[PDB]
Scaffold this active site. Structure first.
Site, mmCIF file in Angstrom:
data_model
loop_
_atom_site.group_PDB
_atom_site.id
_atom_site.type_symbol
_atom_site.label_atom_id
_atom_site.label_comp_id
_atom_site.label_asym_id
_atom_site.label_seq_id
_atom_site.Cartn_x
_atom_site.Cartn_y
_atom_site.Cartn_z
ATOM 1 N N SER A 61 0.775 -1.249 0.000
ATOM 2 C CA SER A 61 0.000 0.000 0.000
ATOM 3 C C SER A 61 0.822 1.324 0.000
ATOM 4 O O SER A 61 0.301 2.361 -0.418
ATOM 5 C CB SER A 61 -1.081 0.008 1.108
ATOM 6 O OG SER A 61 -2.144 -0.939 0.827
ATOM 7 N N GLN A 117 -10.748 -4.537 -2.337
ATOM 8 C CA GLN A 117 -9.966 -5.050 -3.434
ATOM 9 C C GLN A 117 -10.753 -5.348 -4.682
ATOM 10 O O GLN A 117 -11.931 -5.680 -4.625
ATOM 11 C CB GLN A 117 -9.175 -6.279 -2.971
ATOM 12 C CG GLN A 117 -9.970 -7.538 -2.847
ATOM 13 C CD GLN A 117 -9.419 -8.483 -1.781
ATOM 14 O OE1 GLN A 117 -9.670 -8.289 -0.560
ATOM 15 N NE2 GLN A 117 -8.683 -9.534 -2.220
ATOM 16 N N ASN A 335 5.108 -9.677 6.566
ATOM 17 C CA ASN A 335 4.046 -8.728 6.909
ATOM 18 C C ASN A 335 3.949 -8.976 8.408
ATOM 19 O O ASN A 335 3.914 -10.126 8.813
ATOM 20 C CB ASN A 335 2.745 -9.105 6.228
ATOM 21 C CG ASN A 335 1.648 -8.079 6.459
ATOM 22 O OD1 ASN A 335 1.608 -7.337 7.482
ATOM 23 N ND2 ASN A 335 0.725 -8.067 5.525
HETATM 24 C C1 LIG Z 1 -1.995 -2.123 1.476
HETATM 25 O O1 LIG Z 1 -0.903 -2.464 1.863
HETATM 26 C C2 LIG Z 1 -3.176 -3.045 1.655
HETATM 27 N N1 LIG Z 1 -2.869 -4.426 1.119
HETATM 28 C C3 LIG Z 1 -2.244 -4.636 -0.095
HETATM 29 O O2 LIG Z 1 -1.920 -3.665 -0.794
HETATM 30 C C4 LIG Z 1 -1.965 -6.103 -0.621
HETATM 31 C C5 LIG Z 1 -1.956 -7.111 0.514
HETATM 32 O O3 LIG Z 1 -2.854 -7.093 1.394
HETATM 33 O O4 LIG Z 1 -1.076 -7.997 0.550
HETATM 34 C C6 LIG Z 1 -3.010 -6.534 -1.593
HETATM 35 C C7 LIG Z 1 -2.639 -7.287 -2.755
HETATM 36 C C8 LIG Z 1 -3.655 -7.715 -3.680
HETATM 37 C C9 LIG Z 1 -5.050 -7.390 -3.441
HETATM 38 O O5 LIG Z 1 -6.056 -7.816 -4.361
HETATM 39 C C10 LIG Z 1 -5.417 -6.642 -2.294
HETATM 40 C C11 LIG Z 1 -4.403 -6.208 -1.360
HETATM 41 O O6 LIG Z 1 -4.308 -2.455 0.948
HETATM 42 C C12 LIG Z 1 -5.450 -3.345 0.721
HETATM 43 C C13 LIG Z 1 -3.555 -3.153 3.289
HETATM 44 N N2 LIG Z 1 -4.469 -4.340 3.444
HETATM 45 C C14 LIG Z 1 -5.617 -4.300 4.101
HETATM 46 C C15 LIG Z 1 -6.482 -5.554 4.121
HETATM 47 O O7 LIG Z 1 -6.046 -6.676 3.574
HETATM 48 O O8 LIG Z 1 -7.652 -5.496 4.648
HETATM 49 C C16 LIG Z 1 -6.028 -2.994 4.774
HETATM 50 C C17 LIG Z 1 -7.219 -2.846 5.449
HETATM 51 C C18 LIG Z 1 -5.024 -1.882 4.831
HETATM 52 O O9 LIG Z 1 -4.206 -1.886 3.621
#
Ligand SMILES: *C(=O)[C@](NC(=O)[C@@H](C(=O)O)c1ccc(O)cc1)(OC)[C@@H]1N=C(C(=O)O)C(=C)CO1
EC number: 3.5.2.6
Length: 353
Positions: A61, A117, A335
């Site tokens: 992110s 997402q 993570n």
């Molecule tokens: C930002 O870091 C966050 N997550 C991501 O960008 C990726 C991850 O979770 O590994 C990602 C990769 C592919 C996708 O289809 C979705 C996400 O933004 C979504 C992080 N993750 C959260 C979550 O999983 O709920 C948040 C609430 C905060 O941001």
């Protein structure tokens, strides 16, 4: 490395790596505008490659900050306006719920509930359009914030439309190049694969998988050096020579909405400094009512500006205080709880004035 900075960093990161079982980690502290680097462990546990200042880490992110800034740069050039309706840059978005949804709402997660997402089944451009036409808002625009990759990711894609450039070309040309981030990428080139650390999840080595709007929402990889430079450019935009990129950085730190003690910028999130560590650390899918800041408050130097990020195998964090010429970057290939990152970052910066 002043022994002061040295001791606070090590006193803090060591117990962190041990408690979280972080395989590899790079930290940069920007003090009085100068970077200081630190590195621990492994970039690749199997091939025993240590983490160095040239190791690429997945930003997750934290990539949104680059998008907010690229978007801000497009505004500065007069190519887009945050007040424009979304449909102006995608006329095929003719479904009714979109009337009233602006680029501003997209960039700030306030469109009315766009999902966290983009679904994995969205393959093609045709698939993206359908997904957006069929999305049904849960709320009116500008009423609540629901963090989302589908929200910002779309903002990034549209922001670059008038330039005729793809998002990657725009990013490389208008942001990475001017700022000399020569080891920051959306797609890691073959020549740099030797430095692409592996991520670790449940003991397995993993890298982020492709997905729709990935470049725009979580697709950047960078080194501790370039990230320290990225922080210096955001701490001091007035040294950036490219006019539009300068306003662009400033626009991403403007306060558009407020939620509790937090303010939403373009990508970056901000709190008034001094700030309570708890106000940032531990206090999902958390919908939050937001208050519009009308008109937006220009970048405020007495702020704790930050962004957390993660991919399946990486944990990243960036935070800086313009007023103090202070900043920090934390990149790990695991993570780990977001609260331990902010806790560590605050312990270091607050200790440096
Ligand atoms: C930002 O870091 C966050 N997550 C991501 O960008 C990726 C991850 O979770 O590994 C990602 C990769 C592919 C996708 O289809 C979705 C996400 O933004 C979504 C992080 N993750 C959260 C979550 O999983 O709920 C948040 C609430 C905060 O941001």
């Amino acid at each position: 490395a002043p022994q002061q900075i040295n001791d606070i960093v090590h006193r803090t990161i060591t117990p962190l790596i041990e408690q979280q079982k972080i395989p590899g980690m790079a930290v940069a502290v920007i003090y009085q505008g100068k970077p200081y680097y630190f590195t621990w462990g492994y970039a690749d546990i199997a091939k025993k490659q240590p983490v160095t200042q040239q190791t690429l880490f997945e930003l997750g992110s934290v990539s949104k900050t680059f998008t907010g800034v690229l978007g801000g740069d497009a505004i500065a050039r007069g190519e887009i306006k945050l007040s424009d309706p979304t449909t102006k840059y995608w006329p095929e978005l003719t479904a009714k719920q979109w009337n009233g949804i602006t680029l501003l709402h997209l960039a700030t997660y306030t469109a009315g509930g766009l999902p966290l997402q983009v679904p994995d089944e969205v393959k093609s451009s045709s698939d993206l359009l359908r997904f957006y036409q069929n999305w049904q808002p849960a709320w009116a625009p500008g009423t609540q914030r629901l963090y989302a990759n589908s929200s910002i990711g779309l903002f990034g894609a549209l922001a670059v439309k008038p330039s005729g450039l793809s998002f990657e070309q725009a990013m490389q040309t208008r942001v990475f190049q001017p700022l000399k981030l020569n080891h920051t990428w959306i797609n890691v080139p073959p020549a740099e694969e030797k430095n692409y650390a592996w991520g670790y999840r449940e003991g397995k080595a993993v890298h982020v998988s492709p997905g729709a709007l990935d470049a725009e929402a979580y697709g950047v990889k960078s080194t501790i050096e370039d990230m320290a430079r990225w922080v210096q450019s955001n701490l001091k935009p007035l040294d950036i020579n490219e006019k539009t990129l300068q306003q662009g950085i400033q626009l991403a730190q403007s306060r558009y909405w407020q939620t509790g003690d937090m303010y939403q910028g373009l990508g970056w999130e901000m709190l008034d400094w001094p700030v309570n560590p708890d106000s940032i650390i531990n206090g999902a899918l958390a919908a939050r009512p937001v208050k519009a800041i009308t008109p937006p408050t220009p970048a405020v130097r007495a702020s704790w500006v930050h962004k957390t990020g993660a991919t399946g195998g990486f944990g990243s964090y960036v935070a800086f205080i313009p007023e103090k010429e202070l900043g920090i970057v934390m990149l790990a290939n695991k993570n780990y709880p977001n609260p331990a990152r902010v806790d560590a970052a605050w312990q270091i910066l607050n200790a440096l004035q």
